[PDB]
Amino acid sequence: SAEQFYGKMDNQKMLDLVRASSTKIDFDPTLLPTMNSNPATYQGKRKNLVILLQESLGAQFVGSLGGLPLTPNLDELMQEGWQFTQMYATGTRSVRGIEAVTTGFPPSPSRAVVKLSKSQTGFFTIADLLKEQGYHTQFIYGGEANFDNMKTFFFGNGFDQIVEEKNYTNPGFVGSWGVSDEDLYNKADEEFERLSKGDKPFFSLVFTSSNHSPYEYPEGKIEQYDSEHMTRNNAVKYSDYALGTFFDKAKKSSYWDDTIFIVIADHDARVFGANLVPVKHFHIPALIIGKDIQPRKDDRIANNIDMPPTLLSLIGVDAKTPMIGRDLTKPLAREDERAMMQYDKNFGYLTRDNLVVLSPGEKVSTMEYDFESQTMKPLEVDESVIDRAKANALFASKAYQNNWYSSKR
Ligand SMILES: [Cl-]
CB-based contacts of 200: which residues, under 8 Å, 6+ apart?
Answer: 134, 135, 136
Would you list which residues are annotated within the binding site for Mn(2+)?
A: 55, 266-267
Would you list which residues are annotated within the binding site?
A: 55, 212, 266-267
How far does residue 267's CA lie from ligand 1's centre (Å)? 8
Q: For the chain, what percentages of helix, strand and coil (3-state, to nearest 5) are there?
A: 35, 20, 45
User: Residue 258's closest CA among 47, 44, 82, 81?
Assistant: 47
Q: How many CB atoms lie within 10 A of CB 320?
A: 15
User: Residue 114's closest CA among 155, 79, 75?
Assistant: 155
CA dist 250 and 52 (Å) reads 12
How far does residue 303's CA lie from ligand 1's centre (Å)? 14
How far does residue 352's CA lie from ligand 1's centre (Å)? 23
Q: 146: which DSSP letter?
A: T
How far does residue 144's CA lie from ligand 1's centre (Å)? 21
**Resolution reached, in Å?**
2.0
**What experiment produced this structure?**
X-ray
344: left (phi over 0), alpha (psi -120 to 50) or beta: left
CA dist 352 and 332 (Å) reads 13
Phi first, then psi, for residue 204 (nearest 5°) are -125, 125
94 is catalytic: yes
How far does residue 278's CA lie from ligand 1's centre (Å)? 13
* Residue of 56, 94, 239, 397 marked active site: 94
Pairing state between β 48-54 and 319-321 = unpaired
Pairing state between β 161-163 and 296-298 = unpaired
* Domains contained in the chain, CATH given: 1-22+333-409 (3.30.1120.80), 36-322 (3.40.720.10)
Would you list which residues are annotated within the binding site for substrate?
A: 212
